[PDB]
Design a protein around this nucleic acid. Sequence first.
RNA 1: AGGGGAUCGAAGAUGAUCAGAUACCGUCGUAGUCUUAACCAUAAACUAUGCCGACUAGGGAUCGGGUGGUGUUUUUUUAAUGACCCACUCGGCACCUUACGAGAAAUCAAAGUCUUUGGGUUCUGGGGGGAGUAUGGUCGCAAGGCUGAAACUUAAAGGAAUU
Lengths: 87, 23, 206, 96, 81, 123, 129, 217, 97
Amino acid sequence: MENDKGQLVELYVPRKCSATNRIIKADDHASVQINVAKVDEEGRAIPGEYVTYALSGYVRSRGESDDSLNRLAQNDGLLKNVWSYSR
Amino acid sequence: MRAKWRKKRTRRLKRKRRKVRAR
Amino acid sequence: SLPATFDLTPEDAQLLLAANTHLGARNVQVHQEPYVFNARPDGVHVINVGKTWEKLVLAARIIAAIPNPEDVVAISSRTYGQRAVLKFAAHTGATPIAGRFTPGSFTNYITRSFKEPRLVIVTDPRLDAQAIKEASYVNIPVIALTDLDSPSEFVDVAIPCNNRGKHSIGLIWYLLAREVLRLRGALVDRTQPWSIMPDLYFYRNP
Amino acid sequence: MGKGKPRGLNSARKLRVHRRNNRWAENNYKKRLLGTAFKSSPFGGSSHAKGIVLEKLGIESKQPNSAIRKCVRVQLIKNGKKVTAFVPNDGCLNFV
Amino acid sequence: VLVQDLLHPTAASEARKHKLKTLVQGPRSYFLDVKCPGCLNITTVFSHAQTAVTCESCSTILCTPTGGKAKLSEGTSFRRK
Amino acid sequence: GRVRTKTVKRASKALIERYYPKLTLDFQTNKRLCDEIATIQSKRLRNKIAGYTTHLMKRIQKGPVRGISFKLQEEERERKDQYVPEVSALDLSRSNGVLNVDNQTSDLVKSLGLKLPLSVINV
Amino acid sequence: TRSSVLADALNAINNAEKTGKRQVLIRPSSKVIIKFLQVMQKHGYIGEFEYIDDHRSGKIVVQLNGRLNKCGVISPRFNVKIGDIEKWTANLLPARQFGYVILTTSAGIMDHEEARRKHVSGKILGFVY
Amino acid sequence: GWVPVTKLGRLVKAGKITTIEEIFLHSLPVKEFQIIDTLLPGLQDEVMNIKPVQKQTRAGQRTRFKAVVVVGDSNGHVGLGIKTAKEVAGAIRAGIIIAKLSVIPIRRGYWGTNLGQPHSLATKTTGKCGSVTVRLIPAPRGSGIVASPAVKKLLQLAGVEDVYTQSNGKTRTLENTLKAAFVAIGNTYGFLTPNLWAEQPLPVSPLDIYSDEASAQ
Amino acid sequence: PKKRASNGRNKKGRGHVKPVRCVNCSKSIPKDKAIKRMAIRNIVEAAAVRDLSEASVYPEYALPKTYNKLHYCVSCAIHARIVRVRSREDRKNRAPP
RNA sequence: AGGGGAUCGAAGAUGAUCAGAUACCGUCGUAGUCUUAACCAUAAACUAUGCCGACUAGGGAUCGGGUGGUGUUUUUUUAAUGACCCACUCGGCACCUUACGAGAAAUCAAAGUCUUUGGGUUCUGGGGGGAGUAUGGUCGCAAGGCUGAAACUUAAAGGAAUU
Ligand SMILES: [Zn+2]
Ligand SMILES: [Zn+2]
């Protein structure tokens, strides 16, 4: 990645899944990035202001993407009393 | 050619060789 | 955090449990499974209405985030959500696939039925598995209106509802149309529940 | 998940004896060890041999081909086994 | 599932999980300080007896041994621990 | 072997979905409609096309039949869609028959909901 | 019987981190297991782990960060010498930069990087990428 | 005269998707070869195999020509294309467009002692297809490419300088070799190393930035 | 290859099933493997019952049925019984008529 | 070797068919055991999948146990129950239905955790024939069983799926 200097020699620093930390690949289709709208006081949200949550093809396929985003939503304050930690 | 009747043929000529050799 | 006025109003709660969104819920269940509220005797389940409502608000935030209106594709191949998605599409410009899905819709860029959504809203993951499966090939998020025993595969944000009466499907579609039209739209007040009869979403029998 | 073979640190006896046995199934090993070259093999397990030619022979080629292969039957000076050698070019049967 | 925290698990699950297959090995048996129908005593008995335990005065058969938890003698009072 | 092919059965469907008026349940008129409106090559192709438009026009006048929805029938479906006459009642705001709830949905709204007039039943 | 306990502990951690889970339960939990987990923890392949002290061998609940790719044991503890550590860290690891082969050295449970800086050797326990 | 469907095409034609890794960054399914044509001008365009494949018919045997081709840069991008056409002159073309579309990045690294740009692979990668299983064991500097001549120039067009290989299975089968070699080259990005352990913010998709500059009006 | 996940059979948990003679072939076949089908029929055919009843004593004509489980070997069954050898797809469909 | 021998049936008799058919079909029919004692020790002896152990993902059903039903039956007064049944729950069982990993594929609860190769351990194989043959021991009343080669020969033989 680095030359033991400056000059970072690493193109496409890949973006990790938000549920597993697993690197999403360049050809990893079924790897969605959802943008949730940042709300204003009681109604509208800012057009162009988001919170961007990535979920990788593996977590989506497994069928634990609803549960993974439920926890991430509660832990960024998008939901409340939905993902109970200890099932 | 049947791996049974092949085997039986071998097992017959073995017995008839025993009876030939007992002489 | 949210501004914390969207807190399940009693007119919405009584609508949901008059539609029987939770009073059925498939006695035999799938082990996810946090959207449960102590299954009733005589073999039936009862869903958390607070949770499905919270999920509905999250779903609205994602749909409302989608900047161009008609890159949200509202799909319902089953009879009980046909006009529900047609009205959802007409209200908040969201091109519907109410009917047969015609596989090779999101893949197969040549066909005349070619759409490139940045979001899919599916009334049933089982009966519209083709829409979900096709979305998985081209990196599309999917918002489902699932039951308890519905499959969760290749499906993010699921709104837990009922899929037996038709009243649920009609209502939860109206409510999602309602909540999205509030955020950056012509519904200028959160209160006053915008009483356009939630029977413009009910599949009227012949 | 043991992969059949033993994986003890004190199993060098077994791991060696198992190869010593199962090496026999190899072709090169078996004939180098039993010395097949020195019992069979008219050459007695050597490169060349010398001999005195008994007969000129016309061996018929195998079925997809058709020809007379102009061999020579020759008794080996070395041991006394009679082998059949091929004459390796066009008009060389007339030369031998 | 994917995220649980099995250090702090829920009692609605720990109640149902097997005697051994819980967070720590712990028995679901207990002791009954059960009182005689006749000569009032405080005889300690076990959930899953294995013996036809009697009172001290006469052989008044307090329990009958069964496959699991033992039976009681038609009329008596029990107190757990 | 009097089966009509796609070359006539498609032309017929295009013809009816455009000129539903100017088509009158009669071969002898529909024949001359096709003479004027279409540029059909053979006289016998016309007769087959016109004969099948007439067959469709007879079948469409016993209630709309699936496959052929014309520019008028689309406006009828738009009115039955929008002007749905199931708007006299609220409906679904069934303060008379929501409130026939059972003890589990009672405990449900008790936990999360504000307050509702709830008619509790059992099993 | 179960012949080794580090084996099934490291396997269980691998089987969970395959599915991208965020915690594992290890039943047997020896001191050797805890010390291996501590060396994993140091380089940051592992979060925190609790040791539940059931009056027995006890159990562990480890918490993962999805960084650990491979995490295995070498079952027969081969008597390694510092002259031939390079033959192991060339055969087990992805090239040279990262990953660690774990020695049960006399000085204690360590990696090849640490064992080199000390100039000591022992046996081999396993590895982590 | 491209006139692109697929709004990815509309963005890259307009000259907005800069060059070129935002497609790889966001896993954007590219389905137009004229995208790669605009982004990367310098490619080859290097045919590997043309084998006759024969379906037996009622009368006679119909022979197609399954063309395997590698379309790669000289830097960090390779693509493998296998298409069965009725003619070899059309086969190479119909292969090339797939070998362009399925272009993939390689994660080049070091064997320690950085001193300049990456020469080898970053880590020991493997890839499998059928039985043929290829390994790419990164090698010391100036050793050259130590592969079979089939995959040798696949790794040259990838841009790799130094690499040992340990290909096991029926390696003669060329399609299955290159397929497995192309999986192995692709699996480089997909190894979570402490080099790229740092949690960075997720960038917003240019389908969500130029939302209404795509979808032709 | 292996054609069936079963063995055209049931025997799973057992070592040996006591065999059964085919109804027509006489071929002995293990019971579990034998194609069993209950032949339940009216004693009198579905054409004669009119003249049967009209010429019978005891009105209400109970008309008792006949019951016998036909055990068939595989080859005797393939002779146009309910077998009609189906595709490698439809082989797995267990549902009877 | 003793009983026993009804049925069915190697051998054999015999009628058909056949060009021949000492076979397939028909009628008879010894030996044959079904039984007691003593042998033999092989089977497509098969799940063609060694065992002990750990982890990775819906429904019935066998056995045991725990709760719950104001369910049925229960009458000797209300039933003390008990059983059968219903729901939830585990432990073990014979399984089965959908599937991200694996495999050449057919395919699968293990055939997964395998070039990112190591939980313990036993047995077996190294192209096809020759050949499970010869030989030598060993056991057996015999039939045979166990172990078990080589000369020479050959460019394929084989597995799975496709047209
Ligand atoms: Zn006293
Ligand atoms: Zn039969």
